[PDB]
């Protein structure tokens, strides 16, 4: 689900779950316009300011996992199977080849 929604405090949540970036959960400046990039780079623009101040604030963590390595949990979110957990670690390393 790519339907990302901002909060009044500025954090990125998907279905109420905060989005995970390279610095952990993604927090974006409050009241800013966001442009996700082909590699997940998040650029924040403050309204009123000139377009010269567009500066990135983080990067979405995009991971690659086939259907064999993921099993659905009871809350609708997929997670690594035990084998795949022991093979590729508990925390998946982000793949830079993923386009978005």
């Amino acid at each position: 689900n790519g339907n990302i929604q901002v909060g009044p405090t500025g954090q990125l949540t998907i279905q109420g779950h905060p989005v995970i970036g390279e610095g952990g959960p993604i927090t974006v400046p409050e009241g800013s316009e966001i442009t996700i990039a082909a590699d997940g780079t998040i650029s924040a623009l403050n309204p009123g300011d000139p377009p010269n101040t567009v500066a990135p604030v983080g990067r979405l963590k995009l991971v690659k996992a086939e259907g064999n390595e993921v099993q659905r949990s009871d809350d609708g979110l997929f997670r690594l199977t035990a084998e795949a957990q022991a093979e590729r670690g508990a925390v998946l390393a982000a793949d830079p080849s993923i386009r978005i």
Binding site: P29, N52, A55
Partner: protein, 72 residues
């Protein structure tokens, strides 16, 4: 160059306040309070660069520089 665009993100302009203690002698150290002045999100692990602390008479009575401790 005078005509250029610098868009920093790791630098904040701050005001430093301190108390000049009674019978203070040169070379002694005092505590300072560092407060941000414009649209800065945080001062978590910043370092205060050389700052001259003026009095009411606009004379330098102390020189301030150190690492800021923010609660967290």
């Amino acid at each position: 160059p005078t005509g250029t665009n610098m868009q920093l993100k790791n630098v904040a302009a701050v005001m430093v306040t301190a108390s000049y203690p009674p019978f203070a002698r040169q070379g002694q150290t005092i505590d300072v309070v560092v407060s941000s002045m414009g649209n800065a999100k945080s001062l978590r692990g910043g370092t205060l660069l050389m700052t001259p602390l003026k009095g009411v008479d606009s004379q330098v009575y102390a020189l301030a520089q150190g690492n800021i401790l923010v609660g967290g």
